């Protein structure tokens, strides 16, 4: 009868880069999903599968909490059936997703003058990611027919790019912290 440690997911001092997205397993606790919803501090709280007011009256065996940072424009890609740089090459949700997606603007925390380059994303990949796949390789991307041999150059690109989060960015280009809750019984409300 312990409380689920959502505070250490939502209030972590740093978030992961989206390509190396962080996953926390939630088990053996009671979760108040209605304090998360009724916080009124989130810009996105879209649930796929069941309403948040109603899943407080529900139990699951495990809950996964995935967290990362992306651009505000890319939050729309954190949904079933989406395409784009994030959904294709960084974090992919399945078509039959049955959880909740939560996001909020973190320009005050993840941007700095001159640019915060901590947060990375994958720009090049040979194919799309499977749902809930995490690709953390730094192999040089071969964009032509000549092998790269682990050094950059023409047709040989480092696959990861840094966001350049500056506070003067337009909102769509500002950093947003994202939490994805997957539901698959040791977790109740």
């Amino acid at each position: 009868t312990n409380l689920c440690p959502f505070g250490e997911v939502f209030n972590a001092t740093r978030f992961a880069s989206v390509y190396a997205w962080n996953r926390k397993r939630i088990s053996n606790c009671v979760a108040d999903y209605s304090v998360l919803y009724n916080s009124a501090s989130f810009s996105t709280f879209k649930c796929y599968g069941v309403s948040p007011t109603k899943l407080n009256d529900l139990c699951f065996t495990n809950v996964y909490a995935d967290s990362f940072v992306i651009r505000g424009d890319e939050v729309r890609q954190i949904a079933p059936g989406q395409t784009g740089k994030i959904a294709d090459y960084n974090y992919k949700l399945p078509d039959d997703f049955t959880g909740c997606v939560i996001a909020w603007n973190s320009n005050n925390l993840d941007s700095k003058v001159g640019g915060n380059y901590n947060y990375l994303y994958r720009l090049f990949r040979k194919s799309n990611l499977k749902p809930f796949e995490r690709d953390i390789s730094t192999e040089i991307y071969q964009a032509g027919s000549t092998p790269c041999n682990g050094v950059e150059g023409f047709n040989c690109y480092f696959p990861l790019q840094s966001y350049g989060f500056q506070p003067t960015n337009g909102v769509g280009y500002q950093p947003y912290r994202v939490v994805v809750l997957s539901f698959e019984a040791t977790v109740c409300g």
Partner: antibody
Amino acid sequence: EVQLVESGGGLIQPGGSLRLSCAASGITVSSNYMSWVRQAPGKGLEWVSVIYSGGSTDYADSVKGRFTISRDKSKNTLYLQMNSLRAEDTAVYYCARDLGEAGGMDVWGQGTTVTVSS
Amino acid sequence: IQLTQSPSSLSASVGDRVTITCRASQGISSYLAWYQQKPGKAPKLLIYAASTLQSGVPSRFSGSGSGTDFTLTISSLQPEDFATYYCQQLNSYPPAFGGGTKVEIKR
């Protein structure tokens, strides 16, 4: 050696169809972001379409539902299928490899001309 | 995002210092590219990431800026530099292009 050679442009009537080809040498079409960019007579540049290395596609709004971008790995060739052409679509069309933030559009085709007129 | 190039055209002499500016409507950090286009020819990439010189491009070209104000500078104009120049937003499909700047011969 590194080049993009385009063809398929020509005269066509409103509502008609046309297919542009972009045959590549020195870059691998199916491994890259490949873009089409057009330039109407006396005007600037306008992006038309992109196909990702992973197969995802995107289009400018004035072109959605009429244009289809695709590629052939065996021929290392990029295609743009243009349906329901309008007079506005009259332009020189360029294919280009797109590196986005990691470079820009660094390899360009020579361009092919599309005239839509009754 | 909209990109506003200034001026629409400018006249200069060989050896002059030429400055072309691009103003973004919101703030795009360093996601900016500069292209050169001559009549009848395809665009040619000069600079990406606002200030990185494309390989093979002469060093008299340089880019500066981050945020909303960007500049293309030709330190000593050469005869083959008379052409039209375009800025382009990077990292955004529907990418925005500037309206272009024509560099013409002064007399």
